[PDB]
């Protein structure tokens, strides 16, 4: 069920949801999501590079042929925001956690055009997420990074944990270079409680897993 398109891989997860995969030299896969929402397409996370992200837009044109209305990126690291220039070059509205945009220059990333803010319970302030359609954005607390956000896909059983969640076979939570080791466990559990009926957990560096990914990640995080 994987489709190769240039050096990227695309996998349909649901009638209106695909996983995009891009590689950086070993070679490390990074996953994001593409969502068809009526007459438009919404993207979650860039590829590692601008050139790879441009190929995401090419694949969408070929396979979906609907305009990309917006992209949301899940934190200020290269695997999630390394392709911001391809989106901006294409006139696509881009959204990140305000803190991701504030950190972007120090992380060597281009800031998104728009900033998300969050309630004290982690849910996005809806005024800051205009026309997000099925994308339900939740800030679970600091973990992989202080700015990491997560996205549920309304109308589906899918939730995206980005780099916060690792699969149930993971031997480590790496990369922990920018991690909050105190709050990581609670943040992983918060993601599970925010999307309590999601059965397909999509994550940055593993194929989709069951909810065991969340509990397993939280238990590894408890050891930090
Ligand atoms: Zn990261």
């Amino acid at each position: 069920g994987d489709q190769r398109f240039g050096d990227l891989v695309f996998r349909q997860l649901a009638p209106n949801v695909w996983q995009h995969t891009s590689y950086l030299d070993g070679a490390v896969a990074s996953n994001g999501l593409i969502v068809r929402d009526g007459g438009r397409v919404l993207v979650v996370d860039t590829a590692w590079t601008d050139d790879q992200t441009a190929q995401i837009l090419n694949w969408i044109k070929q396979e979906i042929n609907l305009p990309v209305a917006l992209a949301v990126v899940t934190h200020a690291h290269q695997d999630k925001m390394g392709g911001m220039d391809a989106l901006h070059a294409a006139g696509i509205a881009t959204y990140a956690n305000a803190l991701s945009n504030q950190l972007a220059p120090q992380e060597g990333m281009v800031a998104a055009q728009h900033s998300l803010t969050f309630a004290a319970n982690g849910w996005v302030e809806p005024a800051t997420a205009p026309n997000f359609g099925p994308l339900k954005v939740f800030y679970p607390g600091p973990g992989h990074t202080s700015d990491n956000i997560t996205v549920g896909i309304d109308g589906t059983d899918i939730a995206f944990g980005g780099c916060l969640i690792k699969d149930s076979k993971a031997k480590s939570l790496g990369n922990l270079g920018d991690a909050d080791t105190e709050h990581y466990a609670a943040s992983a559990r918060a993601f599970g409680a925010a999307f309590p009926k999601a059965s397909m957990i999509v994550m940055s560096h593993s194929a989709p897993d069951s909810r065991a990914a969340i509990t397993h990640t939280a238990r590894m995080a408890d050891k930090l």
Side-chain angles (χ1 to χ4, degrees):
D2 287 343
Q3 176 188 1
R4 288 80 224 299
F5 181 91
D7 296 324
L8 280 81
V9 176
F10 300 86
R11 180 176 191 87
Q12 192 163 13
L13 300 184
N16 292 317
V17 187
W18 301 258
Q19 182 181 260
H20 64 82
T21 305
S22 61
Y23 301 87
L24 194 64
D25 247 315
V28 176
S30 183
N31 306 319
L33 292 171
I34 301 166
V35 179
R36 172 170 51 205
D37 175 34
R40 66 202 180 128
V41 173
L42 321 170
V43 173
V44 180
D45 287 338
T46 76
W48 295 98
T49 70
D50 296 317
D51 288 343
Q52 290 166 353
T53 304
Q55 294 273 59
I56 294 172
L57 301 186
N58 292 339
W59 179 92
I60 291 164
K61 153 60 206 87
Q62 171 167 119
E63 295 297 336
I64 303 170
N65 194 25
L66 293 173
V68 178
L70 62 89
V72 49
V73 297
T74 59
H75 60 103
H77 278 162
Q78 192 186 350
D79 48 334
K80 309 287 89 186
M81 277 187 93
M84 296 300 283
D85 279 351
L87 299 179
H88 294 172
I92 297 163
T94 57
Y95 296 80
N97 188 348
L99 180 55
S100 304
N101 291 329
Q102 193 170 2
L103 291 178
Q106 278 191 84
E107 289 299 323
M109 300 298 118
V110 174
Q113 294 174 339
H114 303 283
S115 296
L116 307 176
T117 71
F118 299 89
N121 66 6
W123 289 106
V124 67
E125 287 287 352
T128 76
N131 296 320
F132 268 39
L135 302 186
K136 188 182 215 200
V137 183
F138 180 71
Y139 176 61
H144 168 72
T145 63
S146 57
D147 59 315
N148 57 205
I149 59 169
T150 68
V151 185
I153 312 303
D154 265 357
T156 78
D157 304 320
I158 298 166
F160 183 66
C163 302
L164 180 71
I165 305 300
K166 316 308 174 172
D167 85 2
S168 51
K169 292 173 304 229
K171 298 205 218 95
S172 97
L173 291 171
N175 169 32
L176 290 169
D178 292 7
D180 181 333
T181 58
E182 183 190 14
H183 299 124
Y184 199 130
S187 300
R189 291 187 173 96
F191 168 71
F195 303 107
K197 306 293 165 12
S199 61
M200 181 180 291
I201 307 308
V202 179
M203 61 211 107
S204 292
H205 304 296
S206 299
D209 198 4
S210 71
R211 294 186 68 81
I214 302 170
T215 309
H216 186 266
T217 292
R219 286 183 187 169
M220 286 199 283
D222 289 330
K223 299 332 170 283
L224 304 169

PDB file of all heavy atoms in Angstrom, residues 13-14 151-161 165 167-168 191-203 207-215:
ATOM      1  N   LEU A  13      -4.170   6.050   4.706  1.00  0.00           N
ATOM      2  CA  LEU A  13      -4.548   5.485   6.011  1.00  0.00           C
ATOM      3  C   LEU A  13      -6.067   5.388   6.140  1.00  0.00           C
ATOM      4  O   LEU A  13      -6.529   4.628   6.993  1.00  0.00           O
ATOM      5  CB  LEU A  13      -4.026   6.400   7.109  1.00  0.00           C
ATOM      6  CG  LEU A  13      -2.512   6.600   7.122  1.00  0.00           C
ATOM      7  CD1 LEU A  13      -2.144   7.447   8.315  1.00  0.00           C
ATOM      8  CD2 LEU A  13      -1.825   5.264   7.174  1.00  0.00           C
ATOM      9  N   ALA A  14      -6.816   6.220   5.442  1.00  0.00           N
ATOM     10  CA  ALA A  14      -8.300   6.313   5.528  1.00  0.00           C
ATOM     11  C   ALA A  14      -8.746   6.941   4.226  1.00  0.00           C
ATOM     12  O   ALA A  14      -7.912   7.457   3.482  1.00  0.00           O
ATOM     13  CB  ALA A  14      -8.761   7.147   6.713  1.00  0.00           C
ATOM     14  N   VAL A 151      -2.194  16.372  16.831  1.00  0.00           N
ATOM     15  CA  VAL A 151      -3.361  16.695  15.966  1.00  0.00           C
ATOM     16  C   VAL A 151      -4.216  15.450  15.869  1.00  0.00           C
ATOM     17  O   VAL A 151      -3.742  14.425  15.406  1.00  0.00           O
ATOM     18  CB  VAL A 151      -2.917  17.145  14.569  1.00  0.00           C
ATOM     19  CG1 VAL A 151      -4.142  17.575  13.763  1.00  0.00           C
ATOM     20  CG2 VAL A 151      -1.869  18.240  14.656  1.00  0.00           C
ATOM     21  N   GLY A 152      -5.483  15.579  16.199  1.00  0.00           N
ATOM     22  CA  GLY A 152      -6.479  14.536  15.926  1.00  0.00           C
ATOM     23  C   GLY A 152      -7.149  14.811  14.609  1.00  0.00           C
ATOM     24  O   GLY A 152      -7.286  15.988  14.219  1.00  0.00           O
ATOM     25  N   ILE A 153      -7.526  13.756  13.905  1.00  0.00           N
ATOM     26  CA  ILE A 153      -8.228  13.915  12.606  1.00  0.00           C
ATOM     27  C   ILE A 153      -9.690  13.555  12.846  1.00  0.00           C
ATOM     28  O   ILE A 153     -10.059  12.396  12.891  1.00  0.00           O
ATOM     29  CB  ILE A 153      -7.592  13.085  11.485  1.00  0.00           C
ATOM     30  CG1 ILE A 153      -6.069  13.245  11.426  1.00  0.00           C
ATOM     31  CG2 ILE A 153      -8.270  13.441  10.173  1.00  0.00           C
ATOM     32  CD1 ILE A 153      -5.568  14.665  11.261  1.00  0.00           C
ATOM     33  N   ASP A 154     -10.502  14.564  13.054  1.00  0.00           N
ATOM     34  CA  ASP A 154     -11.944  14.393  13.311  1.00  0.00           C
ATOM     35  C   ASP A 154     -12.543  13.609  12.146  1.00  0.00           C
ATOM     36  O   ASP A 154     -12.141  13.769  11.004  1.00  0.00           O
ATOM     37  CB  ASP A 154     -12.604  15.735  13.554  1.00  0.00           C
ATOM     38  CG  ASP A 154     -12.734  16.134  15.019  1.00  0.00           C
ATOM     39  OD1 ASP A 154     -12.354  15.346  15.944  1.00  0.00           O
ATOM     40  OD2 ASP A 154     -13.249  17.241  15.236  1.00  0.00           O
ATOM     41  N   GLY A 155     -13.515  12.779  12.472  1.00  0.00           N
ATOM     42  CA  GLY A 155     -14.245  11.933  11.522  1.00  0.00           C
ATOM     43  C   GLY A 155     -13.495  10.656  11.239  1.00  0.00           C
ATOM     44  O   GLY A 155     -13.883   9.934  10.303  1.00  0.00           O
ATOM     45  N   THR A 156     -12.383  10.402  11.953  1.00  0.00           N
ATOM     46  CA  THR A 156     -11.517   9.217  11.711  1.00  0.00           C
ATOM     47  C   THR A 156     -11.118   8.685  13.086  1.00  0.00           C
ATOM     48  O   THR A 156     -11.322   9.398  14.095  1.00  0.00           O
ATOM     49  CB  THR A 156     -10.249   9.478  10.871  1.00  0.00           C
ATOM     50  OG1 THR A 156      -9.275  10.097  11.716  1.00  0.00           O
ATOM     51  CG2 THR A 156     -10.511  10.327   9.650  1.00  0.00           C
ATOM     52  N   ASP A 157     -10.415   7.565  13.083  1.00  0.00           N
ATOM     53  CA  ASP A 157      -9.860   6.968  14.315  1.00  0.00           C
ATOM     54  C   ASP A 157      -8.374   7.336  14.451  1.00  0.00           C
ATOM     55  O   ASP A 157      -7.688   6.689  15.225  1.00  0.00           O
ATOM     56  CB  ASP A 157      -9.980   5.447  14.235  1.00  0.00           C
ATOM     57  CG  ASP A 157     -11.401   4.956  14.007  1.00  0.00           C
ATOM     58  OD1 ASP A 157     -12.334   5.564  14.632  1.00  0.00           O
ATOM     59  OD2 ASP A 157     -11.564   4.066  13.131  1.00  0.00           O
ATOM     60  N   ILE A 158      -7.912   8.365  13.730  1.00  0.00           N
ATOM     61  CA  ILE A 158      -6.464   8.694  13.669  1.00  0.00           C
ATOM     62  C   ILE A 158      -6.144   9.854  14.590  1.00  0.00           C
ATOM     63  O   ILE A 158      -6.868  10.873  14.570  1.00  0.00           O
ATOM     64  CB  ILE A 158      -6.084   9.008  12.221  1.00  0.00           C
ATOM     65  CG1 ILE A 158      -6.326   7.788  11.325  1.00  0.00           C
ATOM     66  CG2 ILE A 158      -4.665   9.517  12.088  1.00  0.00           C
ATOM     67  CD1 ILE A 158      -6.279   8.169   9.855  1.00  0.00           C
ATOM     68  N   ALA A 159      -5.047   9.746  15.309  1.00  0.00           N
ATOM     69  CA  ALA A 159      -4.459  10.913  15.996  1.00  0.00           C
ATOM     70  C   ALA A 159      -2.966  10.875  15.734  1.00  0.00           C
ATOM     71  O   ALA A 159      -2.380   9.785  15.689  1.00  0.00           O
ATOM     72  CB  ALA A 159      -4.768  10.933  17.469  1.00  0.00           C
ATOM     73  N   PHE A 160      -2.402  12.048  15.591  1.00  0.00           N
ATOM     74  CA  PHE A 160      -0.964  12.220  15.260  1.00  0.00           C
ATOM     75  C   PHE A 160      -0.254  12.745  16.482  1.00  0.00           C
ATOM     76  O   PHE A 160      -0.511  13.895  16.930  1.00  0.00           O
ATOM     77  CB  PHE A 160      -0.870  13.175  14.088  1.00  0.00           C
ATOM     78  CG  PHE A 160       0.518  13.419  13.564  1.00  0.00           C
ATOM     79  CD1 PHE A 160       1.216  12.385  12.972  1.00  0.00           C
ATOM     80  CD2 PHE A 160       1.180  14.609  13.774  1.00  0.00           C
ATOM     81  CE1 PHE A 160       2.485  12.577  12.436  1.00  0.00           C
ATOM     82  CE2 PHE A 160       2.450  14.799  13.238  1.00  0.00           C
ATOM     83  CZ  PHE A 160       3.113  13.775  12.597  1.00  0.00           C
ATOM     84  N   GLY A 161       0.687  11.963  16.983  1.00  0.00           N
ATOM     85  CA  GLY A 161       1.502  12.364  18.141  1.00  0.00           C
ATOM     86  C   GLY A 161       2.833  12.978  17.764  1.00  0.00           C
ATOM     87  O   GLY A 161       3.530  13.402  18.664  1.00  0.00           O
ATOM     88  N   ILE A 165       5.336  10.820  20.606  1.00  0.00           N
ATOM     89  CA  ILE A 165       4.968   9.384  20.745  1.00  0.00           C
ATOM     90  C   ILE A 165       5.903   8.542  19.899  1.00  0.00           C
ATOM     91  O   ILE A 165       6.162   8.877  18.751  1.00  0.00           O
ATOM     92  CB  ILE A 165       3.506   9.175  20.361  1.00  0.00           C
ATOM     93  CG1 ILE A 165       2.575  10.080  21.163  1.00  0.00           C
ATOM     94  CG2 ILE A 165       3.162   7.672  20.515  1.00  0.00           C
ATOM     95  CD1 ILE A 165       2.615   9.910  22.669  1.00  0.00           C
ATOM     96  N   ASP A 167       6.797   4.215  18.933  1.00  0.00           N
ATOM     97  CA  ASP A 167       5.943   3.027  18.816  1.00  0.00           C
ATOM     98  C   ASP A 167       6.210   2.089  19.993  1.00  0.00           C
ATOM     99  O   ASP A 167       7.136   2.291  20.778  1.00  0.00           O
ATOM    100  CB  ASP A 167       6.038   2.429  17.431  1.00  0.00           C
ATOM    101  CG  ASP A 167       7.143   1.471  17.099  1.00  0.00           C
ATOM    102  OD1 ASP A 167       7.967   1.121  17.971  1.00  0.00           O
ATOM    103  OD2 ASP A 167       7.105   1.027  15.936  1.00  0.00           O
ATOM    104  N   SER A 168       5.363   1.076  20.102  1.00  0.00           N
ATOM    105  CA  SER A 168       5.368   0.198  21.304  1.00  0.00           C
ATOM    106  C   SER A 168       6.623  -0.673  21.335  1.00  0.00           C
ATOM    107  O   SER A 168       6.896  -1.253  22.383  1.00  0.00           O
ATOM    108  CB  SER A 168       4.074  -0.584  21.393  1.00  0.00           C
ATOM    109  OG  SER A 168       3.808  -1.232  20.176  1.00  0.00           O
ATOM    110  N   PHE A 191      -1.889  13.491  25.794  1.00  0.00           N
ATOM    111  CA  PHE A 191      -2.222  13.208  24.389  1.00  0.00           C
ATOM    112  C   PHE A 191      -3.216  12.038  24.307  1.00  0.00           C
ATOM    113  O   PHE A 191      -4.211  12.148  23.621  1.00  0.00           O
ATOM    114  CB  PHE A 191      -0.949  12.882  23.623  1.00  0.00           C
ATOM    115  CG  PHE A 191      -1.199  12.301  22.268  1.00  0.00           C
ATOM    116  CD1 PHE A 191      -1.708  13.101  21.247  1.00  0.00           C
ATOM    117  CD2 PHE A 191      -1.002  10.956  22.021  1.00  0.00           C
ATOM    118  CE1 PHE A 191      -1.920  12.548  19.996  1.00  0.00           C
ATOM    119  CE2 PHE A 191      -1.211  10.435  20.755  1.00  0.00           C
ATOM    120  CZ  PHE A 191      -1.657  11.238  19.747  1.00  0.00           C
ATOM    121  N   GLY A 192      -2.969  10.974  25.078  1.00  0.00           N
ATOM    122  CA  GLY A 192      -3.876   9.812  25.075  1.00  0.00           C
ATOM    123  C   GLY A 192      -5.261  10.220  25.576  1.00  0.00           C
ATOM    124  O   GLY A 192      -6.253   9.779  24.977  1.00  0.00           O
ATOM    125  N   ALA A 193      -5.335  11.050  26.617  1.00  0.00           N
ATOM    126  CA  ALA A 193      -6.632  11.469  27.224  1.00  0.00           C
ATOM    127  C   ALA A 193      -7.356  12.445  26.299  1.00  0.00           C
ATOM    128  O   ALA A 193      -8.608  12.513  26.328  1.00  0.00           O
ATOM    129  CB  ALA A 193      -6.434  12.023  28.598  1.00  0.00           C
ATOM    130  N   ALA A 194      -6.618  13.232  25.495  1.00  0.00           N
ATOM    131  CA  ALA A 194      -7.205  14.231  24.588  1.00  0.00           C
ATOM    132  C   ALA A 194      -7.936  13.542  23.445  1.00  0.00           C
ATOM    133  O   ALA A 194      -8.963  14.059  22.984  1.00  0.00           O
ATOM    134  CB  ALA A 194      -6.114  15.163  24.087  1.00  0.00           C
ATOM    135  N   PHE A 195      -7.442  12.381  23.011  1.00  0.00           N
ATOM    136  CA  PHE A 195      -7.983  11.656  21.840  1.00  0.00           C
ATOM    137  C   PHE A 195      -8.294  10.245  22.302  1.00  0.00           C
ATOM    138  O   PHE A 195      -7.615   9.298  21.903  1.00  0.00           O
ATOM    139  CB  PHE A 195      -6.991  11.689  20.679  1.00  0.00           C
ATOM    140  CG  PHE A 195      -6.588  13.071  20.242  1.00  0.00           C
ATOM    141  CD1 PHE A 195      -5.323  13.556  20.547  1.00  0.00           C
ATOM    142  CD2 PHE A 195      -7.511  13.936  19.659  1.00  0.00           C
ATOM    143  CE1 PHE A 195      -4.961  14.844  20.168  1.00  0.00           C
ATOM    144  CE2 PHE A 195      -7.145  15.225  19.298  1.00  0.00           C
ATOM    145  CZ  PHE A 195      -5.864  15.664  19.540  1.00  0.00           C
ATOM    146  N   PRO A 196      -9.250  10.084  23.234  1.00  0.00           N
ATOM    147  CA  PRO A 196      -9.370   8.829  23.972  1.00  0.00           C
ATOM    148  C   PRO A 196      -9.905   7.678  23.129  1.00  0.00           C
ATOM    149  O   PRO A 196      -9.698   6.540  23.557  1.00  0.00           O
ATOM    150  CB  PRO A 196     -10.339   9.152  25.122  1.00  0.00           C
ATOM    151  CG  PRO A 196     -11.159  10.306  24.560  1.00  0.00           C
ATOM    152  CD  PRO A 196     -10.209  11.109  23.685  1.00  0.00           C
ATOM    153  N   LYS A 197     -10.485   7.973  21.975  1.00  0.00           N
ATOM    154  CA  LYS A 197     -11.047   6.915  21.122  1.00  0.00           C
ATOM    155  C   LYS A 197     -10.182   6.697  19.886  1.00  0.00           C
ATOM    156  O   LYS A 197     -10.470   5.736  19.158  1.00  0.00           O
ATOM    157  CB  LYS A 197     -12.474   7.269  20.697  1.00  0.00           C
ATOM    158  CG  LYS A 197     -13.392   7.576  21.879  1.00  0.00           C
ATOM    159  CD  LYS A 197     -13.658   6.370  22.761  1.00  0.00           C
ATOM    160  CE  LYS A 197     -14.257   6.687  24.127  1.00  0.00           C
ATOM    161  NZ  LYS A 197     -14.750   8.092  24.258  1.00  0.00           N
ATOM    162  N   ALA A 198      -9.119   7.450  19.654  1.00  0.00           N
ATOM    163  CA  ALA A 198      -8.224   7.187  18.501  1.00  0.00           C
ATOM    164  C   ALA A 198      -7.651   5.768  18.625  1.00  0.00           C
ATOM    165  O   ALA A 198      -7.109   5.450  19.671  1.00  0.00           O
ATOM    166  CB  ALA A 198      -7.087   8.205  18.459  1.00  0.00           C
ATOM    167  N   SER A 199      -7.696   4.988  17.556  1.00  0.00           N
ATOM    168  CA  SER A 199      -7.150   3.616  17.557  1.00  0.00           C
ATOM    169  C   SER A 199      -5.894   3.507  16.679  1.00  0.00           C
ATOM    170  O   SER A 199      -5.235   2.434  16.717  1.00  0.00           O
ATOM    171  CB  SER A 199      -8.232   2.654  17.135  1.00  0.00           C
ATOM    172  OG  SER A 199      -8.705   2.910  15.837  1.00  0.00           O
ATOM    173  N   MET A 200      -5.669   4.477  15.783  1.00  0.00           N
ATOM    174  CA  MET A 200      -4.507   4.516  14.883  1.00  0.00           C
ATOM    175  C   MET A 200      -3.673   5.722  15.326  1.00  0.00           C
ATOM    176  O   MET A 200      -4.107   6.877  15.142  1.00  0.00           O
ATOM    177  CB  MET A 200      -4.879   4.614  13.415  1.00  0.00           C
ATOM    178  CG  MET A 200      -3.669   4.632  12.571  1.00  0.00           C
ATOM    179  SD  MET A 200      -3.998   4.744  10.808  1.00  0.00           S
ATOM    180  CE  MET A 200      -4.736   3.171  10.415  1.00  0.00           C
ATOM    181  N   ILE A 201      -2.527   5.433  15.895  1.00  0.00           N
ATOM    182  CA  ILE A 201      -1.642   6.516  16.411  1.00  0.00           C
ATOM    183  C   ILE A 201      -0.508   6.663  15.404  1.00  0.00           C
ATOM    184  O   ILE A 201       0.249   5.735  15.201  1.00  0.00           O
ATOM    185  CB  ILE A 201      -1.141   6.195  17.815  1.00  0.00           C
ATOM    186  CG1 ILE A 201      -2.294   5.861  18.766  1.00  0.00           C
ATOM    187  CG2 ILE A 201      -0.280   7.336  18.326  1.00  0.00           C
ATOM    188  CD1 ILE A 201      -3.409   6.862  18.818  1.00  0.00           C
ATOM    189  N   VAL A 202      -0.506   7.794  14.700  1.00  0.00           N
ATOM    190  CA  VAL A 202       0.508   8.133  13.677  1.00  0.00           C
ATOM    191  C   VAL A 202       1.614   8.907  14.384  1.00  0.00           C
ATOM    192  O   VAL A 202       1.328   9.717  15.309  1.00  0.00           O
ATOM    193  CB  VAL A 202      -0.163   8.896  12.526  1.00  0.00           C
ATOM    194  CG1 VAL A 202       0.810   9.292  11.440  1.00  0.00           C
ATOM    195  CG2 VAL A 202      -1.315   8.073  11.941  1.00  0.00           C
ATOM    196  N   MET A 203       2.846   8.628  14.006  1.00  0.00           N
ATOM    197  CA  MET A 203       3.967   9.290  14.709  1.00  0.00           C
ATOM    198  C   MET A 203       5.085   9.555  13.710  1.00  0.00           C
ATOM    199  O   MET A 203       5.038   9.048  12.596  1.00  0.00           O
ATOM    200  CB  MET A 203       4.448   8.435  15.890  1.00  0.00           C
ATOM    201  CG  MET A 203       4.955   7.129  15.606  1.00  0.00           C
ATOM    202  SD  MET A 203       4.543   6.037  17.154  1.00  0.00           S
ATOM    203  CE  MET A 203       3.238   5.094  16.402  1.00  0.00           C
ATOM    204  N   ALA A 207       5.918   3.421  11.765  1.00  0.00           N
ATOM    205  CA  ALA A 207       4.632   3.165  11.089  1.00  0.00           C
ATOM    206  C   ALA A 207       3.538   3.356  12.137  1.00  0.00           C
ATOM    207  O   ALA A 207       3.777   3.244  13.349  1.00  0.00           O
ATOM    208  CB  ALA A 207       4.557   1.767  10.500  1.00  0.00           C
ATOM    209  N   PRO A 208       2.284   3.588  11.716  1.00  0.00           N
ATOM    210  CA  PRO A 208       1.215   3.708  12.684  1.00  0.00           C
ATOM    211  C   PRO A 208       1.088   2.517  13.617  1.00  0.00           C
ATOM    212  O   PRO A 208       1.286   1.386  13.189  1.00  0.00           O
ATOM    213  CB  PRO A 208      -0.037   3.952  11.835  1.00  0.00           C
ATOM    214  CG  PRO A 208       0.534   4.585  10.568  1.00  0.00           C
ATOM    215  CD  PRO A 208       1.865   3.909  10.347  1.00  0.00           C
ATOM    216  N   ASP A 209       0.692   2.801  14.846  1.00  0.00           N
ATOM    217  CA  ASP A 209       0.624   1.794  15.919  1.00  0.00           C
ATOM    218  C   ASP A 209      -0.710   1.947  16.605  1.00  0.00           C
ATOM    219  O   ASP A 209      -1.481   2.886  16.356  1.00  0.00           O
ATOM    220  CB  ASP A 209       1.835   1.886  16.861  1.00  0.00           C
ATOM    221  CG  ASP A 209       2.108   0.679  17.736  1.00  0.00           C
ATOM    222  OD1 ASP A 209       1.394  -0.364  17.613  1.00  0.00           O
ATOM    223  OD2 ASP A 209       3.042   0.765  18.509  1.00  0.00           O
ATOM    224  N   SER A 210      -0.988   1.015  17.501  1.00  0.00           N
ATOM    225  CA  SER A 210      -2.174   1.084  18.354  1.00  0.00           C
ATOM    226  C   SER A 210      -1.922   2.033  19.521  1.00  0.00           C
ATOM    227  O   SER A 210      -0.811   2.579  19.676  1.00  0.00           O
ATOM    228  CB  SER A 210      -2.553  -0.297  18.856  1.00  0.00           C
ATOM    229  OG  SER A 210      -1.588  -0.733  19.808  1.00  0.00           O
ATOM    230  N   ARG A 211      -2.893   2.116  20.395  1.00  0.00           N
ATOM    231  CA  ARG A 211      -2.787   3.009  21.579  1.00  0.00           C
ATOM    232  C   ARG A 211      -1.670   2.552  22.521  1.00  0.00           C
ATOM    233  O   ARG A 211      -1.218   3.340  23.323  1.00  0.00           O
ATOM    234  CB  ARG A 211      -4.123   3.105  22.312  1.00  0.00           C
ATOM    235  CG  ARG A 211      -5.230   3.775  21.523  1.00  0.00           C
ATOM    236  CD  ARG A 211      -6.444   3.949  22.392  1.00  0.00           C
ATOM    237  NE  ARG A 211      -6.230   4.908  23.457  1.00  0.00           N
ATOM    238  CZ  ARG A 211      -6.301   6.227  23.314  1.00  0.00           C
ATOM    239  NH1 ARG A 211      -6.571   6.758  22.143  1.00  0.00           N
ATOM    240  NH2 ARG A 211      -6.109   6.992  24.363  1.00  0.00           N
ATOM    241  N   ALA A 212      -1.210   1.310  22.440  1.00  0.00           N
ATOM    242  CA  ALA A 212      -0.058   0.840  23.235  1.00  0.00           C
ATOM    243  C   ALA A 212       1.159   1.751  23.046  1.00  0.00           C
ATOM    244  O   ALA A 212       1.966   1.830  23.951  1.00  0.00           O
ATOM    245  CB  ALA A 212       0.297  -0.584  22.891  1.00  0.00           C
ATOM    246  N   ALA A 213       1.320   2.407  21.902  1.00  0.00           N
ATOM    247  CA  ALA A 213       2.439   3.349  21.651  1.00  0.00           C
ATOM    248  C   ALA A 213       2.386   4.430  22.736  1.00  0.00           C
ATOM    249  O   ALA A 213       3.441   4.892  23.213  1.00  0.00           O
ATOM    250  CB  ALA A 213       2.348   3.916  20.276  1.00  0.00           C
ATOM    251  N   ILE A 214       1.192   4.905  23.041  1.00  0.00           N
ATOM    252  CA  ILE A 214       1.045   6.049  23.989  1.00  0.00           C
ATOM    253  C   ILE A 214       1.487   5.565  25.361  1.00  0.00           C
ATOM    254  O   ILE A 214       2.289   6.235  26.032  1.00  0.00           O
ATOM    255  CB  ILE A 214      -0.402   6.555  24.023  1.00  0.00           C
ATOM    256  CG1 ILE A 214      -0.874   6.983  22.638  1.00  0.00           C
ATOM    257  CG2 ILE A 214      -0.490   7.700  25.017  1.00  0.00           C
ATOM    258  CD1 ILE A 214      -2.340   7.259  22.560  1.00  0.00           C
ATOM    259  N   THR A 215       0.913   4.459  25.832  1.00  0.00           N
ATOM    260  CA  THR A 215       1.203   3.945  27.183  1.00  0.00           C
ATOM    261  C   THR A 215       2.661   3.541  27.291  1.00  0.00           C
ATOM    262  O   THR A 215       3.326   3.885  28.276  1.00  0.00           O
ATOM    263  CB  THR A 215       0.357   2.716  27.497  1.00  0.00           C
ATOM    264  OG1 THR A 215      -1.005   3.057  27.217  1.00  0.00           O
ATOM    265  CG2 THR A 215       0.535   2.287  28.934  1.00  0.00           C
TER     266      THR A 215
END
